[PDB]
Amino acid sequence: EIAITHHVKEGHEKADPSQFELLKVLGQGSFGKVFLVKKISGSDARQLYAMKVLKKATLKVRDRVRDILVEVNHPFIVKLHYAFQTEGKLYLILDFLRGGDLFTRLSKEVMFTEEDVKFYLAELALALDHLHSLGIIYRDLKPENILLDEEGHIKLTDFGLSKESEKKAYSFCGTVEYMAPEVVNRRGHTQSADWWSFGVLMFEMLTGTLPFQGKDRKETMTMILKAKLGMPQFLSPEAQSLLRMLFKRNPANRLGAGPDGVEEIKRHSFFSTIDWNKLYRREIHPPFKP
Numbered sequence: 001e002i003a004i005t006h007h008v009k010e011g012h013e014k015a016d017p018s019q020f021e022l023l024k025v026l027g028q029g030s031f032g033k034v035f036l037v038k039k040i041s042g043s044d045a046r047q048l049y050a051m052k053v054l055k056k057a058t059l060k061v062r063d064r065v066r067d068i069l070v071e072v073n074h075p076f077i078v079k080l081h082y083a084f085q086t087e088g089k090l091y092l093i094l095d096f097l098r099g100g101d102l103f104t105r106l107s108k109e110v111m112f113t114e115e116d117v118k119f120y121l122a123e124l125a126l127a128l129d130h131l132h133s134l135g136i137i138y139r140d141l142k143p144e145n146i147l148l149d150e151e152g153h154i155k156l157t158d159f160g161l162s163k164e165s166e167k168k169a170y171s172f173c174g175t176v177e178y179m180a181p182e183v184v185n186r187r188g189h190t191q192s193a194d195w196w197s198f199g200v201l202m203f204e205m206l207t208g209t210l211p212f213q214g215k216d217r218k219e220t221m222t223m224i225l226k227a228k229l230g231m232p233q234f235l236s237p238e239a240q241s242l243l244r245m246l247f248k249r250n251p252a253n254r255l256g257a258g259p260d261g262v263e264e265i266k267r268h269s270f271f272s273t274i275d276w277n278k279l280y281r282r283e284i285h286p287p288f289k290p
């Protein structure tokens, strides 16, 4: 069943079905049945949203890590604004994403080159850093968290998404393959854990394989902690360099962990061709158009 993790903002106003007016019912391909609704009251009164109703899903609510700012839209993020349960149903109120699709659906269809990956990772880097500024730490950022809009640009979900099944429940069940060593350790971690996951995403985009993978969770964990990564030699020196710097096991040494954070990554030679201002303005075309 789907577990949805809602990272609630500081002054969040709780909601219920009565705060929303139904506008339309849509079939959105990979998104299934989506209701278009309008918020009736509150700070966001009159705002249009998508609503998903999930029959059998669990909701986990988590605090973000800490001026009085009202949030505005980021070009490469879709947000979960409200999540609430009723008589056996989970309601999700989300940014409306017309004609959206799954990154996975695209990764299964194409063979990415380094040039392709530069675009997607650059948009993802902007999104991830923005979430960090909002106080969100992903932990197990993975391809399931990555959508594409109708124009083919990245939309990173600001909410967690996972599959959970005599068996005891856990507050955090993450996909091990994408977790940093310090996360697997349960010893404590920061947003620098997510830059490791970013590297895993990059490795998988470039190679179609995961860098650390065992026969079972236990083994994969051992590999993340101790395995010597065999770096694919077909990768450019710049790609190899970026991956090695993201796959530092001691988070203090990992690219993106310094005071400048994402800037350490933006400055890396792998991304030298990217104009970050043009990118943010959505003035660079995606390599693949759905």
Ligand SMILES: C[C@@H]1O[C@@H](Oc2c(-c3ccc(O)cc3)oc3cc(O)cc(O)c3c2=O)[C@H](O)[C@H](O)[C@H]1O
Pocket: 002, 028, 030, 031, 032, 033, 034, 050, 051, 052, 078, 079, 094, 095, 096, 097, 102, 143, 144, 145, 146, 147, 157, 161
């Ligand atoms: C919660 C998800 O809702 C639906 O897909 C959507 C997703 C999504 C799909 C697959 C993923 O791996 C992650 C997310 O995201 C949305 C984001 C929005 O801002 C608005 C939406 O309507 C969906 C949206 O309708 C689909 O029903 C998915 O099966 C379900 O898991």
